[PDB]
Amino acid sequence: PQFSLWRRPVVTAHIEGQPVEVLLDTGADDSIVTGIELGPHYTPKIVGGIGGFINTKEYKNVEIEVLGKRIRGTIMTGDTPINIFGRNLLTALGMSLNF
Amino acid sequence: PQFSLWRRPVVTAHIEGQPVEVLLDTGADDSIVTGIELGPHYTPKIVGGIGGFINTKEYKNVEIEVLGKRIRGTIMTGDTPINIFGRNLLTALGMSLNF
Numbered sequence: 065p066q067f068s069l070w071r072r073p074v075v076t077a078h079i080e081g082q083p084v085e086v087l088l089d090t091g092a093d094d095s096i097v098t099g100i101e102l103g104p105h106y107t108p109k110i111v112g113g114i115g116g117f118i119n120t121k122e123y124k125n126v127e128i129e130v131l132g133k134r135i136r137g138t139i140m141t142g143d144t145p146i147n148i149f150g151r152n153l154l155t156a157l158g159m160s161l162n163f
Numbered sequence: 164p165q166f167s168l169w170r171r172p173v174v175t176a177h178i179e180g181q182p183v184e185v186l187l188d189t190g191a192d193d194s195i196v197t198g199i200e201l202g203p204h205y206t207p208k209i210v211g212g213i214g215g216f217i218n219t220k221e222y223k224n225v226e227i228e229v230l231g232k233r234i235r236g237t238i239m240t241g242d243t244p245i246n247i248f249g250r251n252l253l254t255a256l257g258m259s260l261n262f
Contacts (some may be wrong), residue, residue, distance in 0.1 A: 067260035069250040073189055088260055090172055091188025091247055096213070113213025114195070114243055131262065144213055148190055151168040161166035161187055163230065163258040 066162070077130035077149065079139060084147055086130070090161055092150030096120055096140045099147070109140055118143040131157060165261070176229035176248065178238060183246055185229070189260055191249030195219055195239045198246070208239055217242040230256060 067073040073088040082100050096111060102123045109120040120142035128135040130149070135156050149157075166172040172187040181199050195210060201222045208219040219241035227234040229248070234255050248256075 065262065067189075069189060069253045069258060069260070072192075072250070073260050087190050089188065089190025090166075090168060090260070091186050091190045091245075093171075111213065112244060113215075114210065114245075114247075115212040115215025115217045118214045145211060146190075146213075148213075151171070154168045157262055159168060159260060159262040161168070161172050161189070161258060162261040163164065163256055 075130060075149075077128055079129075080127050081129075086147045086149045088154060088159070089148040089150060090154065092148050093152065094138070094140055094150040095148055095153045096142055096144040096150075097147040098142065098144045100141065102126065102139065102141055106141075109142075111140065111142070128153070133157065174229060174248075176227055178228075179226050180228075185246045185248045187253060187258070188247040188249060189253065191247050192251065193237070193239055193249040194247055194252045195241055195243040195249075196246040197241065197243045199240065201225065201238065201240055205240075208241075210239065210241070227252070232256065 106121040109122050120140035125136045126139045205220040208221050219239035223237050224235045225238045
């Protein structure tokens with residue numbers, strides 16, 4: 065199936081059974097969400113975006129449900145204005161940029 | 164043809180005949196580049212990214228060459244750490260997010 069880019073390629077994912085709205089975003093190496101609690105077990109980060117950097121909490125082998133797929137993968141949590149699924153999760157999902 | 168997301172979907176565009184390396188990025192509404200002079204004729208902006216906002220110069224019906232296509236479209240210029248072609252230019256280019 066497909067996403068044409070006339071609208072934001074936005075979707076609903078359950079991370080550990082909580083549901084979040086994420087933008088599928090080719091331009092990110094990682095995936096940052098806010099709004100969900102992933103717990104105690106993390107290594108911190110610093111991510112760079114357009115206008116600065118933010119402080120995030122890095123979580124590995126995290127349960128993700130999205131597009132009728134069950135995936136395990138790394139997610140960061142922090143100060144993001146929008147939730148993104150970066151290229152790390154799109155490779156896993158089997159996605160391509162077609163033209 | 165296609166971009167699988169194992170590598171950054173990066174490409175070379177000529178904006179007004181100058182060549183720039185751009186990341187095709189689904190997660191942007193617009194396209195911001197730095198490094199090129201587009202001239203005097205602009206309306207300013209403020210774009211929001213992850214960590215803040217930046218100040219940009221908005222240019223319309225700008226000549227773009229990329230992927231053996233000649234396109235006209237809006238580009239912003241400013242403080243971007245990476246050059247991006249947002250969803251505004253990918254619709255024009257005939258791109259889709261396939262899975």
